[PDB]
Every structure is written in C-alpha cells, then in structure tokens.
Amino acid sequence: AISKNLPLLNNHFRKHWQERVRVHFDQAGKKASRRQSRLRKAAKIAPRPIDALRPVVRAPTVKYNRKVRAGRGFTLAELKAVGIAPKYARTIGISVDHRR
Amino acid sequence: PSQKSFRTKQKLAKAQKQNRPLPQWIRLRTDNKIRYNAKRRHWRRTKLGI
Amino acid sequence: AGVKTFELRTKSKEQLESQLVELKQELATLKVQKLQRPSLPRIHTVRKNIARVLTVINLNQRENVRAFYAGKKYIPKDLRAKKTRALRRKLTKFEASQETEKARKQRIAFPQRKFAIKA
Amino acid sequence: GKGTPSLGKRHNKSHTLCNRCGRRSFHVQKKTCSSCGYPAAKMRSHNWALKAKRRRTTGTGRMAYLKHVTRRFKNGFQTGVAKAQT
Amino acid sequence: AMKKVEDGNTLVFQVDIKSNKHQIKSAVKELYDVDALYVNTLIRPNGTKKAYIRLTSDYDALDIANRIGYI
Amino acid sequence: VAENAGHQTSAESWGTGRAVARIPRVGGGGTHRSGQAAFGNMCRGGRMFAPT
RNA sequence: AAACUUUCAACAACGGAUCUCUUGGUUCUCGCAUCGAUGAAGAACGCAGCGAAAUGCGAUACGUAAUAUGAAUUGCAGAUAUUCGUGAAUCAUCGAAUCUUUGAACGCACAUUGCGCCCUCUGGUAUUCCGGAGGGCAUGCCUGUUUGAGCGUCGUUU
RNA sequence: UGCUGUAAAGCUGGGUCGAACGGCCUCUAGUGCAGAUCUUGGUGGUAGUAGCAAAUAUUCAAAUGAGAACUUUGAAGACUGAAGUGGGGAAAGGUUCCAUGUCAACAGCAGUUGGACAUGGGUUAGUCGAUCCUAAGAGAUGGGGAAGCUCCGUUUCAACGUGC
RNA sequence: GCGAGAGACCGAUAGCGAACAAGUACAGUGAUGGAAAGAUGAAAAGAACUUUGAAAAGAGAGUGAAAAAGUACGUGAAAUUG
RNA sequence: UUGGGCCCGGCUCUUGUCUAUGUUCCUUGGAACAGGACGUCACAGAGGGUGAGAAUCCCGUGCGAUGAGAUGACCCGGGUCU
Ligand SMILES: [Mg+2]
Ligand SMILES: [Mg+2]
Ligand SMILES: [Mg+2]
Ligand SMILES: [Mg+2]
Ligand SMILES: [Mg+2]
Ligand SMILES: [Mg+2]
Ligand SMILES: [Mg+2]
Ligand SMILES: [Mg+2]
Ligand SMILES: [Mg+2]
Ligand SMILES: [Mg+2]
Ligand SMILES: [Mg+2]
Ligand SMILES: [Mg+2]
Ligand SMILES: [Mg+2]
Ligand SMILES: [Mg+2]
Ligand SMILES: [Mg+2]
Ligand SMILES: [Mg+2]
Ligand SMILES: [Mg+2]
Ligand SMILES: [Mg+2]
Ligand SMILES: [Mg+2]
Ligand SMILES: [Mg+2]
Ligand SMILES: [Mg+2]
Ligand SMILES: [Mg+2]
Ligand SMILES: [Mg+2]
Ligand SMILES: [Mg+2]
Ligand SMILES: [Mg+2]
Ligand SMILES: [Mg+2]
Ligand SMILES: [Mg+2]
Ligand SMILES: [Mg+2]
Ligand SMILES: [Mg+2]
Ligand SMILES: [Mg+2]
Ligand SMILES: [Mg+2]
Ligand SMILES: [Mg+2]
Ligand SMILES: [Mg+2]
Ligand SMILES: [Mg+2]
Ligand SMILES: [Mg+2]
Ligand SMILES: [Mg+2]
Ligand SMILES: [Mg+2]
Ligand SMILES: [Mg+2]
Ligand SMILES: [Mg+2]
Ligand SMILES: [Zn+2]
C-alpha cells in the first residue's frame, strides 16, 4: 500500500463521487446562449446602455491595497456632491450603494 | 365453481373471447407480420390466475 | 356519408329528436337483417348519423345555457374555462396588477428614464 | 409430507383481484393490496424497486387527458372556435 | 331460440347488460306494442344478456317475429 | 453506455455445491431467463468490462 | 475380400456463425414549463361490415363537431357515398362535444354489479307501495347567511 | 490452385455469392482466446441403449375407414361389489359441457377416437343460494399519540336522530 | 415531461430488459421476477396445369435476374451427419 | 418631474402558401441510380425516396417573399379619447 520513494497523496475519492461528476460539455453552448441573451437584452433597451455606471474602490486587505477596482454603487455622499438623488440616480444608469 | 361472482364471470367471458385463432383476412394485408395468435391459452396448460 | 351537419343545425329541438328516433329504428332494423346478410356495411353510416344528431342536439342546448349565463358572476363549471387546475388558481390580471398607493407614488415619481451617452 | 402431499392442499386464495389495480394482490383477510396499497389514498411505491415503477406509471396506460395538454398549451389554452376563412 | 317463438310463445332478445326485467318489459311494449307475460333474463358465457320474453295469449309470438323480420 | 446497463437484475450467485460456475444467476422460474448468468463481462446481457 | 472404424474431398443435411444492412438503442447539446375534485395518473370491461393482439376510442365507443386540405380507402366487401365540390380520405389541424364501470374517488358499502335517502317528472285506481327518467346527498378548512346553545355575560321589569 | 514471410500473417487460382470494400501516411480503441465446474446458443458418443412390468382380462364378428390390438355396434368373458370404478355437491378450475367437422402437433405404442384442433350452440328462479343477521374478529368517526408513513381506541372526557 | 439538432458511440449474444402484438409471453399466494424473437424477392410474379399418392408430399411444368431465393426463404461457417 | 383606456404597427412565438438545373446519346444490367460522351443549375454538391453509388427523376436543401393566428399591468413607436 505504501511503496517506493514517492510523494504521499491525498486523493479524496472514497465517497460515491461518480454520482456527482459535472462535466462541462456545454461550455460552448452556454457561451453562445449567453451571447444571445446579451444581444437580446441590449436590443430591448437601445440606445440606453446595458451597464450601470459603477464606482471605483480600493480592494480590501494588505495584499490588495495597491489595486483599485469597480465597486458596487456610488455612496449617498458622492451622489449628494453631484446633486443626484439615489432614487433618481437609479433611473439614469447610475448604481447606488447605501452601505459604503 | 358454479357459484361465482359477477366480477369473476366477467373476467372469464373476456378470457374466452381472447382465445380465438387469427382471422385469416389479416394475413393478406400489406406489410403484415402477424402469422398467428401468439397469446393462445389452454385451460389445462396455463391458468388464468383470477 | 349520411346526414349533413349544416342541415341539422337549421332544425328545431322537435325535428332533431324526431330524426333521432327514425335513425334508431333504422339501426334496429339493420341489426335484424344483419342476422342473415350477414355483412351489412350500411350499419356504419347510420351509427355515425346517430352520433351527428346527438352532437347537434347537445351543442344547440349548450349555447342556450351559455346565452342564459352570459355576463353572470356564477356559471356552471363545464361552461367555465378549462385551462388547467394551476392556471385557474393563479391571480387574475386585476389581482396581479394590484399596487399599494405608496408603491404607485414611487413608480410615477421615478419612471425608468430613456437616455444615451456620449453627447 | 411437506412437498408433494402438502401441495395438494392449496385451494384457499390469500389474494383476490384489487379494485384499484386489478392485479390479484388484494389480501383478503388484511383487506389491503400488496401491489398498489389499496385502500390507502397514496399508491404503494418504493425507491428500492425502480423496475416496479416502470411497470405501473404515467405512460403505461392511455394518458387520455395528459395526451392533449401539450397541444392545448402550444395554442395558449384557446377558448372559442376556429373561424372559417372568407 | 326459434323453437321458443313457435312452441312457447316466447321472444328471445339480446338485451343490454345493465337493464332489468322492468325495463325490458317496458321496452318491448314501446318498441313492438306487445305485452309480456314474464321476462326471464340470463347473462351468457360471452358476457351478453339474453332475455326470454313470453307474451300473453293476446299476442302470437310468431306473428310478432315476422313483423320484426327475422322469421 | 447506460450507467445501469447489465445491472437491472436481482441476480445472486448459487454458491458452490450445485455443479455450476459461481457467476450470479437470475432467480425465479417460468421464463427461460431464469437461472441464467448475469452481471459479468463474460455473460450475455451483463455489463461490459470498465463501462465507458 | 467385404462389413466396420478413422481421415480427406465433392454434393446433400444439421445448425445459424460470418458478411452486409437498421423506422432501435446509447450519449452530448439546444429550446420550453403544461397533471388533478372543471375528477388526474392508473385499472377493468367494452367498441369495427368481416379482429385475436398492438394502436385508437367510450353505449355519439378504430370515433362526433369544427378548421384546413383536396380524391381517396384498400385484405376483401359496400353504399339510401363522393369528384369544376359545404367534398373522398386525413389523431392534417383542433378551440366544440361525447367520455361505460372505476380510481385521490365523494350517499353507505364493496371477495356483493349489495343497500339507502331527498327533489322534479312519469306508469300502475297512490303524500305513504311498486316501476321508470332526470337531478342530488363525502370529509377537513376559510369567508359569509340563517337557525340556535350556555346565570360566560350587558341592559330593563316585577 | 499455389506464391511470399522464421513467424504473427499477406497475396493468389477454382467454386459459391450479391453491395459494398481495400492499399499507404497518421489517429483512436469496448482490438487478438483453448481452457476460467467461464456465458449464451447449437451438436455428439452413450444409444435405437435404460426403459415404456402396481391397480385380476380380455376375445370373436360386423360396420367405418387408405389404413383397426386400441373407434362404433353386437355377442361373450370379467371386475368395482352400495365406506363402489355408482349417483351428487363444497373448494379449485373456466367452457373442459353439447353437436358437427376434424388428425399437423399433443394423448411417452397407435389412432378413423379424445378433456386435442376448428366452427357453432348452450346456463331461464318472488319460493334454490347470494343478498340480510350477528360470531371469533376487522374497522371509520369524536378524540389522544406520532416528524410522519400512520398508531390507539369502538362510544371511547362528544351538543352524535340524514328520528319516528 | 415536451420539442429539436447531433456523435471518431452499438450494430440484433451488441445497443435500453425490450429494433418485433416488451414490461409482452411465462413464473410466483405475494412482494416481485421476466425472456426469446429483425432480413424471400424490384415486384408474390407465393408455383396455374398434368401426373403418382388416403393425405402430407413427390415428379414434370410454371414465375423470377436467380428457386445454388419456395415463406422450414439473403449469405448459410463449425461441431455433428448421410 | 407626472395619470389612465382603446387602435394600428414593430418585436417574440406558432403556423399556411410559394421557388434552379438532363431523366439527351452509347454499353452492361431484370431494373441505370453504373461506366463513357455532351451538358445545365449552384446563396441549392445536406438528407431521404425511386427496381444498384442520383445536385440536375421526386420530396426536400439554399434564398427569401407573403398570409393567418396568438401573446405582453409589468416591451417601444406612433396615433387617438379622457
Ligand atoms: Mg495526511
Ligand atoms: Mg393442474
Ligand atoms: Mg337469473
Ligand atoms: Mg447489454
Ligand atoms: Mg453482423
Ligand atoms: Mg358479503
Ligand atoms: Mg472466384
Ligand atoms: Mg466475391
Ligand atoms: Mg441486395
Ligand atoms: Mg481509405
Ligand atoms: Mg474486450
Ligand atoms: Mg472457444
Ligand atoms: Mg452449454
Ligand atoms: Mg445427446
Ligand atoms: Mg430395450
Ligand atoms: Mg419399472
Ligand atoms: Mg366392444
Ligand atoms: Mg366381484
Ligand atoms: Mg365432450
Ligand atoms: Mg403417441
Ligand atoms: Mg401418430
Ligand atoms: Mg379446444
Ligand atoms: Mg330461500
Ligand atoms: Mg337483494
Ligand atoms: Mg365484536
Ligand atoms: Mg380523528
Ligand atoms: Mg441517435
Ligand atoms: Mg438484445
Ligand atoms: Mg435481452
Ligand atoms: Mg435470417
Ligand atoms: Mg389424386
Ligand atoms: Mg443468386
Ligand atoms: Mg439467394
Ligand atoms: Mg437460405
Ligand atoms: Mg462439416
Ligand atoms: Mg424544386
Ligand atoms: Mg439507392
Ligand atoms: Mg451516368
Ligand atoms: Mg439521391
Ligand atoms: Zn391493487
């Protein structure tokens, strides 16, 4: 059961694993249908953009301080500084975050 | 037995009517594959289980 | 191929029931002759004629009940829509479109705008 | 005498025809069907007998009403009659 | 069956399985305008019901059989 | 192949002492399938070795 | 030497391999959301001019209506069936119907085609008995209606 | 019919046959059988062999038929011997009943015969049974358990008549 | 479940148990168990007729491209057999 | 900054109808759908059928065109009435 100078392995296959094997044969089909959904969503509301405007936020932790990324929504203070109400902002393609 | 229920006697009537040979004009139909009745039953051989 | 359904639809209750009786004695007479012929294909025609007259009688009586109950709140369940059990339990359009006065004020105050970018 | 001689004393049916499934599994003294579970409201079925589900399930009979639900759904559950073309 | 039409003044009919002797007696009166002395019924080995209808002495069953048209 | 091909049987080995190979066999009676071997890659109607 | 045994070849047997097919299976992907007390799924019994099964259907019974289409069906037979047409065949389509006895299965019961009761009509000299036709009578729960119960309890009168 | 290769094998003559198939460069795998008391199917020797020996027992003639140990009829000889090899039924079977036709298979010989095969016919009730009653028992309801499938209980801590 | 499109998949002992009147026939008191079974030919043209036979059949003949395709049906291996 | 109802469109879904070019010659064959010659169409040389391997014989395929039915407070574009 243990033989030769080999690494000791951890192969977690002692349950009925073969009943829970998900093979992604539909990767290309899902890519194509996802693109079609995206076209339909865009053509429904054109020329209004499909994406809400997102803020830019620093990533948390000491490992990702340096990076900056897209947040979830603009804070109430930020929208206040440009004179937009959050209820109104949500209707002109601007995302709001009451939590930040 | 002679003393039988209606439900029993009704099953025995259907069993008699299903126990007939194939009508011969059926073998003349186009693309016909049935040569004989394959569901025959003799009283002594196979029991009805009723 | 027997009687014509459009000719039957122009008849009264008494004329349709009278013709049904005549068709049944014809079918009864044919079954007596079937004892000796014995092959008698005309039996098929009379059997489907009885079905047509019975159909027209039943259909004619059903718009009479439909006309009686037209616009009423409660009608017989065989005259109601027969979509599915689940679709009948579903909220009506009026009930599904019900809205609180608070929710109606906010929908009106902030409709989805129509806009574009880069101008 | 537990073989051939004892087999001659078999003339008392333990089961008769079931009214629900018609199978001859209705235990006379228990008044229960060993096959469909009649007269219980639910049908007797077990996940340890998948072949038994095959024998009696939707599609093994006529489906005299589910036959047509797909065709009625496809037409949006129409009410009314077809209109003759001019 | 035809020996009964002649000797016993009895008409033999195939009858619906669900009908009783009261309904059979009425039916022959309405269809053939004839009075039944009695109706003896029977379910056959093939699953159909047979009725022995004896007519009263007012009617001659042989004349009725010709009127229906099977003798 | 089907995940249950060759395994839709309640076959049980007869054991030794009956002058037949110890392969599992179909139970019951009254059909010609009864007493026939099952489940084996060498058996007619069994599942293949290492099903795909 | 025959016969017999064995081997081989030819032809013939026995048997159904091989080859070649394939309206089937298996696996993958894409799309959709639609069973039932308005009685489902399932069961039993029936139904055709001549059918046992399978398929279809329910006493309107291998189907009725409707829409479309446009000359068949076919094994045989046959129209009181049809052809420049309300017209052959058609689960082509399908929106109107029919839908036996059952089944969650619902008057009670069911190893019984057992036994009630109510309403309207009808036959037998009948509010009461017997017969027939049609329509009804399950349970839990919700809203409401009506009729009630309890010194639980309020007001008033001796 | 031969040729080539140490070989696994390849090619070829003749016969049969009837709809697809091969060489080479690569790819791929459910890829090679003598065995597994292997699996499924088929076939032998055994072998025209073991055997077809309980229940006393058959025979003559005619008829029928292509064909008669076995069918039918007659004559005889026998047996069961009324706790029957007689005449009915319950359970169980389900058309085996009856008539006509009929012999491929089945009736471990035979077959003109049959519980076989084919086509028809046949089961008649106010009084015979079921139906009704209750028995040991089974089991809804009101309730009480149980996550629940369901368990207990049978008038039960119930406002219990579809009353007459 | 419904509706589609596919494959370096299997090719009738394989592939679903089931390519067929398959969850059928059949077994079991019951829960359940559960097969075998595809292929004449382009077309039945499925062999009229004569003859021997009680008949089944055979021999002539006939159809067909082929009967070295006769439904005991394409090809028709081996065991086994004349 | 702004309410509601209908009417026609568009979108979505389903469905009907409509469409290029050899069956020319020779050989084999029972049959040409095989071989050869000369071609034609092709936004169609996918697939199937027809007496053998058929783009051109048939259905289809490709390209689109044009009707019918639906459906949508919670899709938009116009009208139109409040
Ligand atoms: Mg470790
Ligand atoms: Mg026996
Ligand atoms: Mg009686
Ligand atoms: Mg397999
Ligand atoms: Mg092969
Ligand atoms: Mg009883
Ligand atoms: Mg050669
Ligand atoms: Mg060759
Ligand atoms: Mg060929
Ligand atoms: Mg190649
Ligand atoms: Mg292998
Ligand atoms: Mg071997
Ligand atoms: Mg073997
Ligand atoms: Mg042997
Ligand atoms: Mg001997
Ligand atoms: Mg002996
Ligand atoms: Mg004698
Ligand atoms: Mg004696
Ligand atoms: Mg007899
Ligand atoms: Mg014998
Ligand atoms: Mg013999
Ligand atoms: Mg018989
Ligand atoms: Mg009595
Ligand atoms: Mg009674
Ligand atoms: Mg008691
Ligand atoms: Mg309770
Ligand atoms: Mg496929
Ligand atoms: Mg198979
Ligand atoms: Mg198999
Ligand atoms: Mg073959
Ligand atoms: Mg002769
Ligand atoms: Mg040949
Ligand atoms: Mg051949
Ligand atoms: Mg052959
Ligand atoms: Mg050999
Ligand atoms: Mg074209
Ligand atoms: Mg071809
Ligand atoms: Mg050419
Ligand atoms: Mg082609
Ligand atoms: Zn049951």
- Which helix (H) or strand (E) segment holds residue C18: the answer is helix C13-33
Strands A68-70 and D15-16, bridge-based pairing: unpaired
Sheet strands side by side (includes E36-43):
E10-15, E49-55, E36-43
F1: which 2 tokens? Answer: 């192949």
Return the half-sphere exposure (C-beta side, CA atoms, 13 A cut-off) of residue C47.
7
- By three-state DSSP, how is residue E39 classified? strand
Measured in Å, residue D30 CA sits from the centre of ligand 26 at: 22
Answer for the pair B34, B27: CB distance below 8 angstroms, yes or no.
yes
Residues E53 and E29: their CA atoms lie apart, in Å, by 11
**Which residues, other chains included, contact C55 with Cβ-Cβ below 8 Å and sequence gap of 6+?**
C5
Answer for the pair A61, A39: CB distance below 8 angstroms, yes or no.
no
First and final C-alpha spacing in chain F: 6
Strands D32-33 and E10-15, bridge-based pairing: unpaired
> Which bases in strand H are touched by protein, i.e. have an atom under 7 Å from a CB?
30, 36-41, 89-96, 115-119, 121-126, 129, 138-139, 149-150
Residues C77 and C64: their CA atoms lie apart, in Å, by 15
Which residue pairs, CB below 8 angstroms and at least 24 apart, start in A56-61? A57/A100
Strand J proximal to C113 Cβ, under 7 A: no
Residues E58 and E32: their CA atoms lie apart, in Å, by 14
Question: Which residue is associated with the tokens 């009940």?
Answer: C65
Strand J proximal to C118 Cβ, under 7 A: no
Alpha carbon A78 to its chain's center:
23
Q: Is D18 part of any known ligand binding site? A: yes
Q: Does C77 touch chain A (CB under 8 A)?
A: no
Cited resolution, angstroms:
2.3
Which residue pairs, CB below 8 angstroms and at least 24 apart, start in A81-86? none
Residues E2 and E9: their CA atoms lie apart, in Å, by 10
First and final C-alpha spacing in chain C: 75
Answer for the pair A93, A49: CB distance below 8 angstroms, yes or no.
yes
**Which residues, other chains included, contact B13 with Cβ-Cβ below 8 Å and sequence gap of 6+?**
E45, E46, E47
Strand G proximal to C86 Cβ, under 7 A: yes
Query: Which 53-112 residues of chain C touch chain D by CB within 8 A?
Result: 81, 83-84, 87
Strands F24-25 and D32-33, bridge-based pairing: unpaired
At A3, the amino acid letter reads S
Q: Output helix, strand, coil percentages for chain B, rounded to the nearest 5.
A: 30, 0, 70
Q: Does E31 touch chain C (CB under 8 A)?
A: yes
Q: CB B9 to CB E43 under 8 A?
A: yes
Helices (H) and strands (E) in chain D, counts: 3, 3
- The C-alpha angle C79, C80, C83, rounded to 5 degrees, equals 125
Q: Considering all nucleic acid strands, name the nucleotide whose C1' atom is nearest to the C-alpha of residue D13.
A: I29
DSSP A94: B
- Chain C interface, best mutation among D65, D66, D79, D81, by max C CB count within 10 A: D79
- By three-state DSSP, how is residue E19 classified? coil
Handedness of CA F23, F27, F32, F38 (dihedral sign): negative
Q: HEC string of F1-52?
A: CCCCCCCCCCCEECCCCCCCCCCEECCCCCCCCCCCECCCCCCCCCCCCCCC
DSSP A47-83: TS-SS-B--EEEPPSSSSSS-EEE-S-B-HHHHHHTT
**Phi-psi category of D44—alpha, beta or left, where left has phi over 0 and alpha has psi -120 to 50?**
beta
Strand I proximal to B38 Cβ, under 7 A: yes
Residues A34 and F9: their CA atoms lie apart, in Å, by 43
Residues E59 and E63: their CA atoms lie apart, in Å, by 8
At F12, the amino acid letter reads E
**Which residues, other chains included, contact C92 with Cβ-Cβ below 8 Å and sequence gap of 6+?**
none
Measured in Å, residue A80 CA sits from the centre of ligand 3 at: 98
D39 prior amide bond cis, ω within 30: yes
Alpha-carbon distances of D36 from B7, D42, D58, E53, rounded to whole Å: 20, 8, 14, 45
Answer for the pair D55, D42: CB distance below 8 angstroms, yes or no.
no
A21: which 2 tokens? Answer: 């094997």
- By three-state DSSP, how is residue C31 classified? helix
Among C50, C44, C46, C47, smallest CA distance to C8 is for C50
Alpha-carbon distances of A7 from A12, A13, E42, rounded to whole Å: 15, 18, 90
At A90, the amino acid letter reads R
C104: which 2 tokens? Answer: 């109606």
Residues A65 and A46: their CA atoms lie apart, in Å, by 38
**Which ligand is closest to the CA of F45, given by its number?**
4
C68: which 2 tokens? Answer: 């009686």
CA of E5 to C1' of G125 (A): 34
Among F48, F35, F33, smallest CA distance to F2 is for F48
Residues F8 and D50: their CA atoms lie apart, in Å, by 9
Q: Does E47 touch chain B (CB under 8 A)?
A: yes
**Beta-bridge partners for E14:** E50
Alpha carbon B13 to its chain's center:
10
State the angle between helix axes of C42-68 and C13-33 in degrees (0 to 180), rounded to the nearest 10: 160
Strand J proximal to C93 Cβ, under 7 A: yes
Q: CB B17 to CB E43 under 8 A?
A: no
**Beta-bridge partners for A69:** A57
The method recorded for this entry reads cryo-EM
Alpha-carbon distances of B29 from B23, B32, B40, rounded to whole Å: 12, 5, 22
Measured in Å, residue B31 CA sits from the centre of ligand 37 at: 21
- By three-state DSSP, how is residue D84 classified? coil
Measured in Å, residue D85 CA sits from the centre of ligand 36 at: 29
- By three-state DSSP, how is residue E49 classified? strand
